[PDB]
Each structure stands twice: as structure tokens, then as C-alpha cells.
Coordinates of C-alpha atoms and ligand atoms in Angstrom, one line a residue:
Chain A
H10 CA 2.4 -40.2 -50.5
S11 CA 2.9 -42.9 -47.9
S12 CA -0.1 -44.1 -46.0
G13 CA -0.7 -45.6 -42.6
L14 CA 1.2 -44.8 -39.4
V15 CA 4.3 -42.7 -40.2
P16 CA 7.0 -41.3 -37.9
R17 CA 7.2 -37.5 -37.8
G18 CA 9.0 -34.7 -36.0
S19 CA 12.2 -36.4 -35.1
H20 CA 15.6 -34.6 -35.0
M21 CA 19.2 -35.9 -34.7
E22 CA 21.2 -35.8 -31.5
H23 CA 24.7 -37.0 -30.9
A24 CA 24.8 -39.9 -28.3
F25 CA 28.1 -40.6 -26.6
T26 CA 29.3 -42.4 -23.4
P27 CA 32.5 -40.5 -22.5
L28 CA 33.9 -43.1 -20.0
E29 CA 32.9 -46.3 -21.8
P30 CA 36.6 -47.1 -22.7
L31 CA 37.4 -47.3 -19.0
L32 CA 35.0 -50.2 -18.5
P33 CA 36.3 -53.8 -18.1
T34 CA 33.8 -55.3 -20.5
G35 CA 32.3 -54.1 -23.8
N36 CA 33.1 -54.1 -27.4
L37 CA 34.0 -50.5 -28.1
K38 CA 36.2 -49.8 -31.1
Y39 CA 38.8 -47.2 -30.3
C40 CA 42.4 -46.0 -30.9
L41 CA 44.8 -44.9 -28.2
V42 CA 47.1 -41.9 -28.4
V43 CA 49.9 -41.4 -25.8
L44 CA 51.1 -37.8 -25.3
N45 CA 54.1 -36.5 -23.5
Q46 CA 52.9 -36.6 -19.9
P47 CA 53.4 -39.1 -17.1
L48 CA 51.1 -42.1 -17.8
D49 CA 48.2 -42.9 -15.5
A50 CA 47.8 -46.5 -14.3
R51 CA 44.7 -47.0 -16.5
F52 CA 46.9 -47.0 -19.6
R53 CA 47.3 -50.7 -19.1
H54 CA 43.7 -51.6 -19.5
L55 CA 43.1 -49.2 -22.3
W56 CA 46.2 -50.5 -24.2
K57 CA 44.8 -54.1 -24.4
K58 CA 41.6 -53.5 -26.2
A59 CA 42.6 -50.5 -28.4
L60 CA 42.6 -51.1 -32.2
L61 CA 45.6 -48.9 -32.8
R62 CA 48.0 -47.5 -30.3
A63 CA 50.3 -44.6 -31.0
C64 CA 52.6 -42.2 -29.2
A65 CA 53.3 -38.6 -30.0
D66 CA 56.9 -37.5 -29.4
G67 CA 57.9 -37.9 -25.7
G68 CA 54.9 -40.0 -25.0
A69 CA 57.1 -42.9 -26.2
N70 CA 59.5 -42.2 -23.3
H71 CA 56.7 -42.3 -20.7
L72 CA 55.4 -45.5 -22.2
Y73 CA 58.9 -47.0 -22.3
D74 CA 59.7 -46.0 -18.7
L75 CA 56.6 -47.6 -17.3
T76 CA 56.8 -51.0 -19.2
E77 CA 60.2 -52.4 -18.2
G78 CA 60.2 -56.2 -18.4
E79 CA 57.2 -56.3 -20.7
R80 CA 57.9 -53.8 -23.4
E81 CA 57.3 -56.3 -26.1
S82 CA 53.6 -56.4 -24.9
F83 CA 53.5 -52.6 -25.3
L84 CA 54.7 -51.7 -28.8
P85 CA 52.9 -48.8 -30.5
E86 CA 51.8 -49.2 -34.1
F87 CA 53.6 -46.0 -34.7
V88 CA 55.4 -43.1 -32.9
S89 CA 55.3 -39.7 -34.5
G90 CA 56.6 -36.2 -33.7
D91 CA 59.8 -34.4 -33.2
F92 CA 62.5 -37.1 -32.8
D93 CA 64.7 -35.0 -30.5
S94 CA 61.9 -35.4 -27.9
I95 CA 62.4 -39.1 -27.8
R96 CA 65.4 -40.5 -25.8
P97 CA 68.0 -42.2 -28.0
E98 CA 67.7 -45.6 -26.5
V99 CA 63.9 -45.4 -26.5
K100 CA 63.8 -44.6 -30.3
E101 CA 66.3 -47.3 -30.9
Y102 CA 64.2 -49.9 -29.1
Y103 CA 60.9 -49.2 -30.8
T104 CA 62.6 -48.9 -34.1
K105 CA 64.3 -52.3 -33.9
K106 CA 61.0 -53.8 -32.6
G107 CA 59.3 -52.8 -35.9
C108 CA 57.4 -49.7 -34.8
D109 CA 56.8 -47.2 -37.5
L110 CA 58.7 -44.0 -36.5
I111 CA 57.2 -41.1 -38.4
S112 CA 58.9 -37.6 -38.4
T113 CA 56.6 -34.6 -38.3
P114 CA 58.7 -31.3 -38.6
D115 CA 55.9 -28.7 -39.0
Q116 CA 56.8 -25.9 -36.6
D117 CA 53.2 -24.5 -36.8
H118 CA 51.4 -27.5 -35.2
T119 CA 51.9 -29.5 -32.1
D120 CA 52.9 -33.2 -32.2
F121 CA 49.5 -34.1 -30.9
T122 CA 47.7 -32.5 -33.9
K123 CA 50.3 -34.0 -36.3
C124 CA 49.9 -37.4 -34.6
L125 CA 46.1 -37.3 -35.1
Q126 CA 46.7 -36.6 -38.8
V127 CA 48.9 -39.7 -39.1
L128 CA 46.4 -41.7 -37.1
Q129 CA 43.6 -40.7 -39.5
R130 CA 45.7 -41.7 -42.5
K131 CA 46.3 -45.1 -40.9
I132 CA 42.6 -45.5 -40.0
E133 CA 41.7 -45.0 -43.6
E134 CA 44.5 -47.2 -45.1
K135 CA 43.5 -50.0 -42.8
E136 CA 39.8 -49.3 -43.4
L137 CA 39.3 -49.3 -39.6
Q138 CA 35.9 -48.6 -38.0
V139 CA 36.6 -46.4 -34.9
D140 CA 34.0 -45.1 -32.4
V141 CA 36.5 -42.9 -30.5
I142 CA 40.1 -41.8 -30.2
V143 CA 41.2 -41.9 -26.6
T144 CA 44.1 -39.5 -25.8
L145 CA 46.2 -39.9 -22.7
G146 CA 47.9 -36.8 -21.4
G147 CA 47.8 -33.1 -22.4
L148 CA 46.0 -31.8 -19.4
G149 CA 48.9 -31.3 -17.0
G150 CA 52.2 -29.6 -17.3
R151 CA 52.9 -26.3 -19.2
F152 CA 49.9 -24.1 -19.3
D153 CA 50.5 -23.2 -23.0
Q154 CA 50.5 -27.0 -23.8
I155 CA 47.2 -27.6 -21.9
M156 CA 45.7 -24.9 -24.1
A157 CA 47.2 -26.4 -27.2
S158 CA 45.5 -29.7 -26.4
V159 CA 42.2 -27.9 -26.2
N160 CA 42.9 -26.2 -29.5
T161 CA 43.7 -29.6 -31.1
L162 CA 40.1 -30.7 -30.3
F163 CA 38.9 -27.7 -32.3
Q164 CA 41.2 -28.5 -35.3
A165 CA 40.3 -32.2 -35.2
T166 CA 36.9 -31.5 -36.7
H167 CA 38.9 -31.0 -39.9
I168 CA 41.2 -33.9 -39.3
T169 CA 38.8 -36.8 -38.5
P170 CA 35.1 -37.6 -38.1
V171 CA 35.9 -39.8 -35.1
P172 CA 35.1 -38.3 -31.6
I173 CA 38.1 -37.5 -29.6
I174 CA 38.4 -37.5 -25.8
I175 CA 41.4 -36.5 -23.7
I176 CA 42.1 -38.0 -20.3
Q177 CA 44.7 -37.3 -17.6
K178 CA 44.7 -38.1 -13.9
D179 CA 41.1 -37.5 -12.8
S180 CA 39.9 -35.4 -15.7
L181 CA 38.4 -35.9 -19.1
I182 CA 37.6 -33.2 -21.7
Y183 CA 35.5 -33.5 -24.9
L184 CA 34.5 -30.8 -27.3
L185 CA 30.8 -30.6 -28.0
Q186 CA 30.1 -29.4 -31.6
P187 CA 27.1 -27.1 -32.3
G188 CA 23.9 -29.2 -31.9
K189 CA 22.3 -31.5 -29.4
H190 CA 24.2 -34.1 -27.3
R191 CA 23.1 -37.0 -25.2
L192 CA 26.0 -37.9 -22.8
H193 CA 25.6 -41.1 -20.9
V194 CA 27.3 -40.8 -17.5
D195 CA 26.2 -44.1 -16.0
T196 CA 29.2 -46.3 -16.5
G197 CA 30.0 -46.1 -12.8
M198 CA 33.5 -44.7 -13.5
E199 CA 32.2 -41.1 -13.2
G200 CA 33.6 -38.8 -10.6
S201 CA 31.5 -36.2 -8.7
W202 CA 32.2 -33.1 -10.8
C203 CA 31.7 -31.9 -14.3
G204 CA 31.6 -28.6 -16.2
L205 CA 30.9 -26.7 -19.5
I206 CA 33.6 -24.4 -20.6
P207 CA 33.0 -21.9 -23.5
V208 CA 36.7 -21.8 -24.5
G209 CA 36.7 -20.3 -28.0
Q210 CA 33.7 -18.0 -28.0
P211 CA 30.6 -17.4 -25.9
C212 CA 27.9 -20.0 -26.4
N213 CA 24.8 -17.8 -26.5
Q214 CA 22.2 -20.5 -26.2
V215 CA 23.0 -23.5 -24.0
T216 CA 20.3 -25.8 -22.6
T217 CA 21.0 -28.9 -20.5
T218 CA 19.2 -31.5 -18.4
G219 CA 20.9 -33.8 -15.9
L220 CA 23.0 -31.3 -14.0
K221 CA 22.6 -29.9 -10.5
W222 CA 22.8 -26.4 -12.1
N223 CA 21.2 -26.6 -15.5
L224 CA 21.3 -24.0 -18.3
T225 CA 18.1 -23.0 -20.1
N226 CA 18.7 -21.0 -23.3
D227 CA 21.5 -19.4 -21.3
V228 CA 24.8 -17.7 -22.2
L229 CA 28.0 -19.3 -21.1
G230 CA 31.1 -17.1 -21.7
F231 CA 34.3 -16.2 -19.9
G232 CA 33.7 -13.3 -17.6
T233 CA 29.9 -13.9 -17.9
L234 CA 29.3 -17.5 -16.7
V235 CA 31.4 -20.7 -16.9
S236 CA 30.1 -23.9 -15.4
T237 CA 32.7 -25.5 -13.1
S238 CA 32.2 -27.6 -10.1
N239 CA 28.8 -28.6 -11.5
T240 CA 27.5 -32.1 -10.6
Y241 CA 24.9 -34.6 -11.7
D242 CA 21.2 -34.9 -10.8
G243 CA 21.6 -38.7 -10.5
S244 CA 19.6 -39.5 -13.7
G245 CA 22.6 -41.1 -15.3
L246 CA 22.2 -38.8 -18.4
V247 CA 23.3 -35.3 -19.4
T248 CA 21.9 -33.6 -22.5
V249 CA 23.5 -30.5 -23.9
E250 CA 22.4 -28.2 -26.7
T251 CA 24.9 -25.6 -27.7
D252 CA 25.1 -23.0 -30.5
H253 CA 28.9 -23.0 -30.6
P254 CA 31.7 -25.5 -29.7
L255 CA 31.4 -26.1 -26.0
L256 CA 34.0 -28.0 -23.9
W257 CA 32.6 -30.7 -21.7
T258 CA 34.7 -31.7 -18.8
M259 CA 34.1 -34.4 -16.1
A260 CA 35.7 -36.2 -13.2
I261 CA 36.9 -39.7 -13.4
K262 CA 36.4 -41.7 -10.2
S263 CA 39.2 -42.6 -7.8
Chain B
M21 CA 48.2 4.8 -23.1
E22 CA 50.1 1.6 -22.4
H23 CA 50.3 -0.7 -19.4
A24 CA 53.9 -1.5 -18.4
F25 CA 54.4 -4.6 -16.3
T26 CA 57.1 -7.1 -15.3
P27 CA 55.3 -10.5 -14.7
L28 CA 58.2 -12.3 -12.9
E29 CA 59.4 -9.4 -10.8
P30 CA 57.9 -10.9 -7.6
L31 CA 60.1 -14.0 -8.2
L32 CA 63.3 -12.0 -8.0
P33 CA 65.3 -12.2 -4.7
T34 CA 65.8 -8.4 -5.0
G35 CA 63.3 -5.6 -5.1
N36 CA 60.8 -3.3 -3.2
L37 CA 57.7 -4.6 -5.0
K38 CA 54.5 -4.3 -3.0
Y39 CA 52.4 -7.4 -3.5
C40 CA 49.8 -9.6 -1.7
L41 CA 50.0 -13.4 -1.8
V42 CA 47.0 -15.7 -2.3
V43 CA 47.4 -19.4 -1.8
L44 CA 44.9 -21.7 -3.6
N45 CA 44.2 -25.4 -3.1
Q46 CA 47.4 -26.9 -4.6
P47 CA 50.7 -28.2 -3.3
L48 CA 53.2 -25.3 -2.9
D49 CA 56.2 -24.9 -5.2
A50 CA 59.7 -24.2 -3.9
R51 CA 59.2 -20.5 -4.6
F52 CA 56.7 -20.3 -1.8
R53 CA 58.9 -19.5 1.2
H54 CA 60.5 -16.5 -0.5
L55 CA 57.2 -15.1 -1.8
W56 CA 55.6 -15.4 1.6
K57 CA 58.5 -13.7 3.3
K58 CA 58.3 -10.5 1.3
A59 CA 54.5 -10.3 0.7
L60 CA 52.7 -7.3 2.2
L61 CA 49.8 -9.5 3.1
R62 CA 49.1 -13.2 2.7
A63 CA 45.8 -15.1 2.5
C64 CA 44.5 -18.6 1.7
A65 CA 41.4 -19.5 -0.3
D66 CA 39.7 -22.6 1.1
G67 CA 41.8 -25.7 0.8
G68 CA 44.9 -23.5 0.3
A69 CA 44.9 -23.4 4.1
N70 CA 45.3 -27.2 4.4
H71 CA 48.3 -27.1 2.1
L72 CA 49.9 -24.3 4.0
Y73 CA 49.2 -25.9 7.4
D74 CA 50.7 -29.2 6.3
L75 CA 53.7 -27.7 4.6
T76 CA 54.7 -25.4 7.5
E77 CA 54.5 -27.9 10.3
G78 CA 57.0 -27.1 13.0
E79 CA 57.1 -23.4 12.2
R80 CA 53.4 -22.6 11.5
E81 CA 53.6 -19.5 13.7
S82 CA 56.0 -18.1 11.1
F83 CA 53.4 -18.7 8.4
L84 CA 50.2 -17.3 9.7
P85 CA 48.0 -15.7 7.0
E86 CA 46.3 -12.4 7.5
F87 CA 43.0 -14.2 6.6
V88 CA 41.6 -17.5 5.3
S89 CA 38.4 -17.3 3.3
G90 CA 36.2 -19.9 1.6
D91 CA 33.6 -22.6 2.2
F92 CA 34.4 -24.1 5.5
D93 CA 33.7 -27.6 4.1
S94 CA 37.0 -27.2 2.2
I95 CA 39.3 -26.6 5.2
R96 CA 40.1 -29.4 7.7
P97 CA 38.6 -28.8 11.2
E98 CA 42.0 -28.9 12.9
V99 CA 43.4 -26.5 10.4
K100 CA 40.5 -24.1 10.7
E101 CA 40.8 -24.3 14.5
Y102 CA 44.6 -23.7 14.5
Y103 CA 44.5 -20.5 12.4
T104 CA 41.4 -19.3 14.3
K105 CA 43.3 -19.8 17.6
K106 CA 46.3 -17.8 16.3
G107 CA 44.2 -14.8 15.5
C108 CA 43.9 -15.4 11.8
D109 CA 40.8 -13.9 10.3
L110 CA 38.6 -16.7 9.0
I111 CA 35.9 -15.5 6.6
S112 CA 33.1 -17.8 5.4
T113 CA 32.2 -17.4 1.7
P114 CA 29.4 -19.9 1.0
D115 CA 28.0 -18.6 -2.3
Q116 CA 27.8 -21.6 -4.6
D117 CA 27.8 -19.5 -7.9
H118 CA 31.3 -18.3 -7.3
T119 CA 34.6 -20.1 -6.5
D120 CA 36.6 -19.5 -3.4
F121 CA 39.4 -18.0 -5.4
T122 CA 37.0 -15.3 -6.8
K123 CA 35.5 -14.7 -3.3
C124 CA 38.9 -14.5 -1.8
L125 CA 39.9 -11.7 -4.1
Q126 CA 36.8 -9.8 -3.0
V127 CA 37.8 -10.1 0.6
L128 CA 41.3 -9.1 -0.3
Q129 CA 40.2 -6.0 -2.1
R130 CA 38.1 -5.0 1.0
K131 CA 41.2 -5.6 3.2
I132 CA 43.3 -3.5 0.9
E133 CA 40.8 -0.6 1.0
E134 CA 40.3 -1.0 4.7
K135 CA 44.0 -0.8 5.4
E136 CA 44.6 1.7 2.6
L137 CA 47.4 -0.7 1.3
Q138 CA 49.4 0.3 -1.8
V139 CA 49.6 -2.9 -3.9
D140 CA 51.4 -3.3 -7.2
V141 CA 50.2 -6.8 -7.9
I142 CA 48.4 -9.8 -6.4
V143 CA 50.4 -13.0 -6.7
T144 CA 48.2 -16.2 -6.7
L145 CA 49.9 -19.6 -6.1
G146 CA 48.2 -22.7 -7.6
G147 CA 45.2 -23.1 -9.8
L148 CA 47.0 -24.3 -12.9
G149 CA 47.3 -28.0 -12.1
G150 CA 44.8 -30.6 -10.9
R151 CA 41.1 -30.8 -11.9
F152 CA 40.6 -29.4 -15.4
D153 CA 37.4 -27.6 -14.5
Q154 CA 39.2 -25.8 -11.7
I155 CA 42.1 -24.7 -14.0
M156 CA 39.5 -23.1 -16.3
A157 CA 37.8 -21.5 -13.2
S158 CA 41.2 -20.0 -12.3
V159 CA 41.2 -18.4 -15.8
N160 CA 37.6 -17.2 -15.4
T161 CA 38.5 -15.6 -12.1
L162 CA 41.0 -13.4 -14.0
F163 CA 38.2 -12.2 -16.3
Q164 CA 36.0 -11.4 -13.2
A165 CA 38.9 -9.8 -11.2
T166 CA 38.8 -6.9 -13.6
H167 CA 35.5 -5.8 -11.9
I168 CA 36.8 -6.7 -8.4
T169 CA 40.1 -4.8 -8.1
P170 CA 42.3 -2.5 -10.2
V171 CA 45.4 -4.3 -9.0
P172 CA 47.0 -6.7 -11.6
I173 CA 46.7 -10.4 -10.8
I174 CA 49.0 -13.2 -11.9
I175 CA 48.7 -16.9 -11.3
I176 CA 51.7 -19.1 -10.9
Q177 CA 52.2 -22.8 -10.5
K178 CA 55.1 -25.2 -11.2
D179 CA 56.7 -23.7 -14.4
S180 CA 53.8 -21.5 -15.6
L181 CA 52.4 -18.1 -15.1
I182 CA 49.2 -16.7 -16.7
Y183 CA 48.1 -13.1 -16.8
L184 CA 45.1 -11.6 -18.6
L185 CA 45.7 -8.7 -21.0
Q186 CA 42.8 -6.3 -21.2
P187 CA 41.9 -4.6 -24.5
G188 CA 44.5 -2.0 -25.2
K189 CA 48.3 -1.9 -25.4
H190 CA 50.8 -3.7 -23.1
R191 CA 54.5 -3.6 -22.5
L192 CA 55.8 -6.7 -20.8
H193 CA 59.3 -6.7 -19.4
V194 CA 60.7 -10.2 -19.7
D195 CA 64.2 -9.5 -18.7
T196 CA 64.2 -10.4 -15.0
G197 CA 66.3 -13.5 -15.7
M198 CA 63.6 -15.7 -14.2
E199 CA 62.0 -16.3 -17.6
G200 CA 61.7 -19.8 -19.0
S201 CA 61.9 -20.5 -22.8
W202 CA 58.3 -20.6 -23.9
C203 CA 55.3 -18.2 -23.9
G204 CA 52.0 -17.9 -25.5
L205 CA 48.9 -15.8 -26.2
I206 CA 45.6 -17.7 -25.6
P207 CA 42.3 -16.2 -26.9
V208 CA 40.2 -17.9 -24.2
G209 CA 36.8 -16.4 -24.1
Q210 CA 36.4 -14.9 -27.6
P211 CA 38.6 -14.5 -30.8
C212 CA 40.9 -11.5 -30.7
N213 CA 40.7 -10.2 -34.2
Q214 CA 43.3 -7.5 -34.0
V215 CA 46.5 -8.6 -32.3
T216 CA 49.9 -6.9 -32.8
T217 CA 53.1 -7.8 -31.0
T218 CA 56.8 -7.1 -31.0
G219 CA 59.4 -9.2 -29.1
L220 CA 58.3 -12.7 -30.0
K221 CA 59.7 -15.2 -32.5
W222 CA 56.4 -15.5 -34.1
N223 CA 54.8 -12.0 -33.9
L224 CA 51.3 -11.1 -34.9
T225 CA 50.5 -8.0 -37.0
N226 CA 46.9 -7.0 -36.8
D227 CA 46.2 -10.8 -36.9
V228 CA 43.4 -13.0 -35.6
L229 CA 43.9 -15.3 -32.6
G230 CA 41.0 -17.7 -31.9
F231 CA 40.5 -21.3 -31.0
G232 CA 40.3 -23.4 -34.2
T233 CA 41.9 -20.5 -36.1
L234 CA 45.2 -19.6 -34.5
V235 CA 46.4 -20.0 -30.9
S236 CA 50.0 -19.0 -30.0
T237 CA 51.7 -21.7 -27.9
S238 CA 55.4 -22.6 -27.7
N239 CA 56.2 -19.1 -28.9
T240 CA 59.6 -17.8 -27.8
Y241 CA 61.4 -14.5 -27.3
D242 CA 63.4 -12.5 -29.8
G243 CA 66.0 -11.6 -27.1
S244 CA 65.2 -7.9 -26.8
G245 CA 63.9 -8.4 -23.3
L246 CA 60.6 -6.8 -24.1
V247 CA 57.3 -8.0 -25.5
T248 CA 54.5 -5.6 -26.5
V249 CA 51.0 -6.6 -27.2
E250 CA 48.0 -4.8 -28.5
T251 CA 44.6 -6.6 -28.4
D252 CA 41.0 -5.8 -29.2
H253 CA 39.6 -8.3 -26.6
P254 CA 40.9 -9.9 -23.3
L255 CA 43.9 -12.1 -24.3
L256 CA 45.6 -14.5 -21.9
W257 CA 49.4 -14.2 -21.7
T258 CA 51.2 -17.3 -20.5
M259 CA 55.0 -17.7 -19.9
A260 CA 57.5 -20.2 -18.7
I261 CA 59.3 -19.7 -15.4
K262 CA 62.9 -20.9 -15.1
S263 CA 63.2 -24.1 -13.1
Ligands
VIB301 C1 26.0 -23.0 -14.4 C2 26.6 -23.4 -13.1 N1 27.5 -24.5 -13.1 C3 28.2 -24.9 -11.9 C4 27.8 -24.2 -10.7 C5 28.5 -24.7 -9.4 N2 29.6 -23.9 -8.8 C6 30.2 -23.0 -9.4 S1 31.5 -22.1 -8.5 C7 31.1 -23.4 -7.2 C8 31.8 -23.4 -5.9 C9 33.2 -24.0 -6.1 O1 33.8 -24.2 -4.8 C10 30.1 -24.2 -7.6 C11 29.5 -25.3 -6.7 C12 26.9 -23.1 -10.7 N3 26.6 -22.5 -9.5 N4 26.3 -22.8 -11.9
VIB302 C1 51.5 -17.4 -33.7 C2 52.4 -18.5 -33.4 N1 52.8 -18.7 -32.0 C3 53.7 -19.8 -31.7 C4 54.2 -20.6 -32.8 C5 55.1 -21.8 -32.5 N2 54.7 -23.2 -32.4 C6 53.5 -23.4 -32.5 S1 53.1 -25.1 -32.4 C7 54.8 -25.3 -32.2 C8 55.5 -26.7 -32.0 C9 54.9 -27.3 -30.7 O1 55.5 -28.5 -30.4 C10 55.5 -24.2 -32.2 C11 57.0 -24.0 -32.1 C12 53.8 -20.4 -34.1 N3 54.3 -21.2 -35.1 N4 52.9 -19.3 -34.4

């Protein structure tokens, strides 16, 4: 047996700062995935420091259409998806510029999901160390596609170990796996609202600290209770313990 | 035994469909003018009033809602004043555990009972774009609506419609001519372990639909003009609307 002072009774929690990638400074290691939605202005800052940048289908069009005059400074490592979704001249441009154009036929999975699978393969091949995968898009447009985006977060647990967030306009979503989470919301990029959405199944035991309306061993479920328009207590930290995957959503300032 | 329904019927220029119109806090789509014209009763939920007011400048008197409900901190002062002045019924719904959309449906059900109105469906405009938490709240309102009113409720914005299918069998007529190319079945809430359909390109046969298991998106029609769905738990139907 060991002797002397020994640590006891600790447990593991998943710490994460959702909006860290939006900060000017820092040394966060992350990849960037551009989906088929109009690009927000923040894509410029995020593009610079990303370790790997990719586009899924039509995302290449949106990237191309917002980078005229400086497209050589915005060349994705790769572009994957259905190639009928990319305009002819756009595909021609990225191809000649050396971008890896990867076809992903599979009619049972979205280009987003297929794009993550390709990204994971590249992360491994290049032995990259990634703290998060930042996805731009997916939360606007066709309602079925917004839902597909959410479902991709559920499938991702089987695609990659790296945390994945999705950001579009003023919103971010991130899927909290069963367990305890420590979310730092003190970057100063945070907006005023947040929420906890029990999308796949009711979360029968949710406990939080840091919210205006906290949950204490409470049930969150559609038709029972869903936390929307929640806000922070000002502590700069939100903790969440959930028994099933629970979708965290939060506002992005401005 | 089965619930027959035609989701896009209200979008048709033709028809004698009795429906109420609810305007949520989002910019209005081109289909607004026509929907307002033939609605039996129109209402605004909070900010919805701001969008209406701004959109109808110059002809506001032709677009006066029966009532406007919600937390008054969501409606601009001048907007609230205007509708009040024109005789619009302004109802305060301050409860912070419920959204203005849900509270608006409660007022609407009261009004329908009060006036003994015969309503086939409640058409909601907005709620599917913007803040992600609010899009999910819109979905949750549909779960709650089942205990608020017996009148079917659909939500429409841009090119999408959502409609919640209660446990049981449904017959959805998708031959109005207003249908877009895609549709889906989203098991928001809980997995639906026994789903059976006809009319889709990818049908389900006593199959499981659940997030992380199988979610039907980008599904399409078989061209028969009819989609039937049997489900064990509430299942969200979503469909494209022709641009
Ligand atoms: C667990 C829980 N999360 C969030 C809210 C807040 N909320 C819910 S609906 C609404 C009004 C929207 O206009 C507000 C503020 C709550 N009460 N309980
Ligand atoms: C039950 C079921 N519903 C829909 C589809 C169709 N689908 C799903 S993802 C995708 C491509 C999206 O870009 C398509 C066409 C399916 N295969 N199975």
C-alpha cells in the first residue's frame, strides 16, 4: 500500500470552452469544415489558424463566392461530397490549384457525415493532434438538413474522438455525451442565450450549475421540459451532468 | 382509425379551408399576403407583431390581427400602441417557463371556443430559422399543442413545413402541386421503434427511427401522391414547399 498523503475520491469530467476558436489569440488545435450554407464573416479568422480546412459539397461554392481576388489564400486541403453539388468552374478551380477532390456517393449518409469520415482519415494519416473540429453551416436552410446536422453529431461518436461543434450565424450547438461536463463560457464571445435540448431521447437525470434556470436531477424531454431561452448566472462556467446525449446550444455575440 | 390530412392545402390559391394564422418573430415569406387574406382569424406572437407592422407599412389597416399576445418586452412600443389604437386585442403572457408561441396557441384556443369557430388547421409562420434554441422551442410547442387544442398545427418558413404525427396511422395527401422535392421523418423526442410507411422512395417497414440509429432526411416521393405513416411515438414530418 502507498503511505503518506494520497488523493482520493476524484472523478472525471469533460472540460471544454465552446467559443475558444473565435478568440483572436490562443493556441487551439482545430480543423475547419465548411458546409453548404452562406458563410459567416468569422470564417476568415477561423480559416487562418485551422490545422486542416475542408469543404463538404456545396460548401466549396460558398467559399469560392466569398473569396474573389484572394482565392489562393483560401484553398481547402480537400473538398468531398457529391460533385454535382459543386459548380463546374469552382471544382475546376480547386482541382487545378491542387486541392484533393474526393467523391462520396453513399446515398444513405449526408455529405457532412461523409466529410467527417474523410477528415478523420486525414487526421490519422498526418498524425494530427486536434482539440476540436469546427463546422461552419448546417443550422439554417431546409429543416430536414438542420436535423441531419444534429444527427451527424450523434454519429460522430463513432467516427472520431475529437469534439465537434457546429456554428452558423449567431448559434452554436454541441452534443454532450453521457457524463459530467464543465463548459467554460467566459471567452467574452458568448451571447445572452443558451439551452439544453434532449433531441434523441428524454434525459431523465440532468443537473446543472451556472444557468439562470438550473436543473437538479430533472427530466428534460420533448413535451415534458426543454430548456430554451436559458441564460447564464454570470459565473463564467456551466456544468452539466446528463444520463443521455444532450444537445447544448448557445448564442454567439453580435 | 386514420388521420387524413393535406399539409400544403392552405398554400393553394383555391379552396374553402378554414384556418387560423399565427405569425411568429421572423421575417415573412412571399406566401404571407395570400395566407392572411383567406385566414379565418389572424394573430401575432410577440415580435411577430413587429415584423407584421414593418412589412405592412402604408396599408396596416388592411393587416390588423384579431389579437397580439406575448411578453410586451418583445413588441416595440410604437407597434404595440398602433395595434392597441386600432382595436387589436393585446394580451400579456408573462410566464417565463413557456414561449410566446405556446402561450399564443392557448389564447387562440380560447378565442376559437369563445367564438365557436370551426377550424380545420392552425397555420404558423416562422419559427424554423434564426436562433437554434428557438427552432427547437417551435418543435417542442408542437408536442405541447396536443394538450392545448385538437386542431392540427403546421409550421412553415421559407421552403420548409413541419407537422407532428401523433402515435397511430396517418394519411398525408401530397398532391396539391405545392410540394417541393424532399421530405423527412424526424424522431425528435424519443426513438420511434415501429414505423411503417408507403409513398416514400425509402419506406420503413416496422423499422426503428432514432437519432444515432436512423433519421430520414432527403427522402422523396414515389409519385403516388400519397404518403401513409404509422408510428408508435410522436414523429415529426417535414416536407419541402415549392419555391
Ligand atoms: C429549464 C429552463 N430553461 C429555460 C427557461 C427559460 N424560458 C423558457 S421559455 C422562456 C420565454 C421565452 O420567451 C424562457 C425565458 C426556463 N424557464 N426553464
Ligand atoms: C430512411 C431513409 N430516409 C431517407 C434516405 C435518403 N438520404 C439520406 S442521407 C441522403 C443524401 C443526403 O445528401 C439521402 C438521399 C435514406 N437513404 N433512408
